[PDB]
Amino acid sequence: DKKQALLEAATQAIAQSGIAASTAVIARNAGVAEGTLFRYFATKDELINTLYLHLKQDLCQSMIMELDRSITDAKMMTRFIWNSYISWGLNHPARHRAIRQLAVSEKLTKETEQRADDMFPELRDLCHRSVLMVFMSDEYRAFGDGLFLALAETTMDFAARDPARAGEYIALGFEAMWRALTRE
Amino acid sequence: DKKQALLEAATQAIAQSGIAASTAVIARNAGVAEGTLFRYFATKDELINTLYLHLKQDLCQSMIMELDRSITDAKMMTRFIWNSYISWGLNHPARHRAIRQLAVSEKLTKETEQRADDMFPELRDLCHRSVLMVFMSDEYRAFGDGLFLALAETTMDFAARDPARAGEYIALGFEAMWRALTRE
Numbered sequence: 627d628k629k630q631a632l633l634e635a636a637t638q639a640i641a642q643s644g645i646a647a648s649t650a651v652i653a654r655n656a657g658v659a660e661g662t663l664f665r666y667f668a669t670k671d672e673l674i675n676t677l678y679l680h681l682k683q684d685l686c687q688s689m690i691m692e693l694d695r696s697i698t699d700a701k702m703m704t705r706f707i708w709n710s711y712i713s714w715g716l717n718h719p720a721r722h723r724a725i726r727q728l729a730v731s732e733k734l735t736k737e738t739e740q741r742a743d744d745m746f747p748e749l750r751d752l753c754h755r756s757v758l759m760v761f762m763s764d765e766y767r768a769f770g771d772g773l774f775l776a777l778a779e780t781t782m783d784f785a786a787r788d789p790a791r792a793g794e795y796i797a798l799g800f801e802a803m804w805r806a807l808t809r810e
Numbered sequence: 811d812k813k814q815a816l817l818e819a820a821t822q823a824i825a826q827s828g829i830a831a832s833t834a835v836i837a838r839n840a841g842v843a844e845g846t847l848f849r850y851f852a853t854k855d856e857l858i859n860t861l862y863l864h865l866k867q868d869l870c871q872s873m874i875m876e877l878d879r880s881i882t883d884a885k886m887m888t889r890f891i892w893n894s895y896i897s898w899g900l901n902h903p904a905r906h907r908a909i910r911q912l913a914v915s916e917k918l919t920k921e922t923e924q925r926a927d928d929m930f931p932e933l934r935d936l937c938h939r940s941v942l943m944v945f946m947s948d949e950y951r952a953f954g955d956g957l958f959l960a961l962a963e964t965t966m967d968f969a970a971r972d973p974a975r976a977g978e979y980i981a982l983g984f985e986a987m988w989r990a991l992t993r994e
């Protein structure tokens with residue numbers, strides 16, 4: 627049970643302070659000693675990796691549960707995926723702030739990145755058919771993920787702060803994202 | 811005149827802890843004592859608007875430098891405007907994070923928004939000529955500026971961390987921004 631309390635606490639501290647969040651802070655917010663956090667996670671980088679995989683699985687499980695297989699137009703399908711991404715972030719603001727900082731941290735291992743793609747393999751396929759070539763490359767995929775997350779978090783933030791127009795920010799955000807990242 | 815130090819400390823502190831104003835810390839790093847402060851500034855709101863108008867001034871003054879005369883193309887001018895925003899942001903990380911924070915407080919007056927937009931009349935006019943009209947409406951103006959800034963900040967993060975490819979990130983980021991926000 628302590629491992630979960632550690633993830634939860636790290637989720638919260640990283641959302642507010644990014645990866646520079648203190649391990650001593652995370653341990654006590656979880657109700658455990660820092661020395662115990664390091665028995666679960668030998669390094670802070672190992673914590674970073676496990677937390678990313680944990681938040682990732684949760685996000686993908688939530689999107690898969692809303693995935694309508696009847697939708698057959700690519701843009702509509704990506705639109706409903708986006709809505710589902712935004713809705714998860716709106717229901718879990720800290721988990722999304724944390725996942726975004728983790729996702730762009732350069733501390734994720736190759737096994738983590740590799741293991742990350744295989745939770746929703748078809749969503750992954752869908753990208754290689756829509757996304758701009760440059761944003762699929764080894765050099766710039768990470769940047770393309772960063773650009774997508776910045777668009778998403780900004781859409782989440784305006785929807786949260788002015789809910790009367792949530793559905794308008796989310797649709798405008800999607801359209802902006804679609805033009806930014808996808809092929810002609 | 812010592813008021814310039816309260817603005818320098820406010821930029822940092824704000825850039826370090828959001829619009830939360832440890833006026834104690836402010837005053838201390840600024841030299842001056844506590845109450846010593848609404849003494850230069852009235853309300854915390856006015857300080858925000860003041861600082862904001864102060865940071866925007868610094869940002870415009872840094873660009874007006876890079877500005878040209880011969881360049882005609884609407885896309886080429888926006889490109890220079892974007893290059894300048896990234897340069898200012900990379901050279902002044904505190905200021906840039908201060909200013910994004912101030913713009914999401916909704917505490918800016920329409921006088922401030924007016925005083926800002928008056929600072930660079932060509933920019934105003936360039937947006938009124940290139941940006942999707944939806945993003946120029948009263949309802950969605952701030953959203954469209956939030957998307958631009960999110961894309962610019964992410965471009966900055968990837969540039970700072972990988973200086974070898976910075977020029978490529980800036981270029982990729984511009985083009986994603988331009989498709990996201992300007993006339994089809």
Ligand SMILES: CN(C)c1ccc(C(=C2C=CC(=[N+](C)C)C=C2)c2ccc(N(C)C)cc2)cc1
Binds near residue numbers: 871909933958959
């Ligand atoms: C002086 N210089 C280099 C500048 C000056 C201003 C900008 C722009 C800007 C910066 C900060 C803002 N806030 C603090 C709220 C709002 C807008 C901007 C410009 C164009 C644009 N579009 C083409 C969509 C969007 C934003 C960019 C470069």
Ligand SMILES: [Cl-]
């Ligand atoms: Cl405490």
